[PDB]
Chain A
Amino acid sequence: RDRRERRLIFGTIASKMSLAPEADLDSLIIRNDSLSGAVIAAIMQEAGLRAVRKNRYVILQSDLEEAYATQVKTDNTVDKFDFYK
């Protein structure tokens, strides 16, 4: 992927959802590496799932960052080096 090329996915999903003006879209394109639109769409969708937990219809910057750490990796077996080979 590319930093600017992925932004087409970020900007498209963000147009169909409500986001605060303090939300930084450049922090997602730099940190994410080799990911598809399905993972990106789950980030903005989790932001709404984190918003309904707080009973706030407007997604703020806090709900955007808290939703990124959950959807960044779906693999539970990662660990780090714990099991060699």
Chain B
Amino acid sequence: GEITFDGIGGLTEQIRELREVIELPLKNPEIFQRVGIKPPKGVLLYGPPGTGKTLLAKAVAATIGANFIFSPASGIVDKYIGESARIIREMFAYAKEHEPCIIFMDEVDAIGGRRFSEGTSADREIQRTLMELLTQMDGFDNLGQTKIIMATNRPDTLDPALLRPGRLDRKVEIP
């Protein structure tokens, strides 16, 4: 990491509960194996833009020791043929090679939304992102050594399909 704990101070009550479900499975994966449960994957950190998004991103990777991966959602949806298909695969391939890593994102409100029937209407790259992110965590091969982090202004502006249990288990507001 880069940012230390002194900047994220005041969240200690919340951070203490987050490190137990994040820092522990990255260091000693056998902690939850004896219990018989699985660690959470997605953790949602949302708040005002520029406040708490950058601090909590580099602070978590500093205390754990895992590398800091910054892959904003603004590098996904564009005009291209199958862009969002190869972004997640190469991002999943980098986390597969180096285990001690944690992926962070930014401004995920543009890649989300449920539309109506959860199909595509005049948005090409949004639906490919919604399904692929669901198939990576709930598929046969997930990231146990890498946690997915998203950042937005409000959780209600995202797709409820990704907010269901099994992928995003944590909603944390940044005051």
Verify A47–B37 contact, CB threshold 8 A: yes
* Complex contacts, B42 vs chain A, CB 8 Å: none
A13 nearest in chain B by CB position: B36
0/1 string, A32-56, CB within 8 A of B gives 1: 0000001100101101110111000
Q: How far is the CA of A57 from the CA of B30 in the complex (A)?
A: 11
With the chains together, A53 CA to B37 CA distance in Å?
13
Contact A53 B35 (CB under 8 A): no
Q: By the criterion CB–CB under 8 Å, are B164 and A74 in contact?
A: yes
User: Which residues of B have CB within 8 Å of A59?
Assistant: 35
B91-118 Cβ-contact flags toward A at 8 Å (1 or 0): 0000000000000000000000000000
- How many of chain A's residues touch chain B, expressed as a range? 20 to 34
A9 within 8 A of B: no
| CB-contact partner of A49 in B21, B164, B171, under 8 A | B21
Given contacts A38-B165, A49-B21, A52-B21, contact A44 B37 (CB under 8 A): yes
Provided the pairs A49-B40, A74-B163, A74-B165 are in contact, do residues A18 and B35 lie with their beta carbons within 8 angstroms?
Answer: yes
Q: A66-77 CB contact bits vs B (8 Å, 1 = yes)?
A: 000001001011
Of the candidates A52, A74, A76, the one whose C-beta lies within 8 Å of that of B32 is A52
Q: Which of A58-84 contact B (CB under 8 A)?
A: 59, 71, 74, 76-77
Is B6 interfacial (CB 8 A cutoff)? no
Contacts of A42 in B (CB 8 A): 165, 169
- Please tell me if A25 contacts chain B, counting CB pairs below 8 Å: no
Task: Given A52-B20, A76-B155, A76-B156, answer yes or no on A71-B35 (Cβ-Cβ < 8 Å).
Answer: no
Q: Does A17 contact B (CB under 8 A)?
A: yes
Q: What 5 A-B pairs have minimum CB-CB distances, sorted nearest first?
A: A48-B37, A17-B36, A53-B20, A48-B35, A42-B165
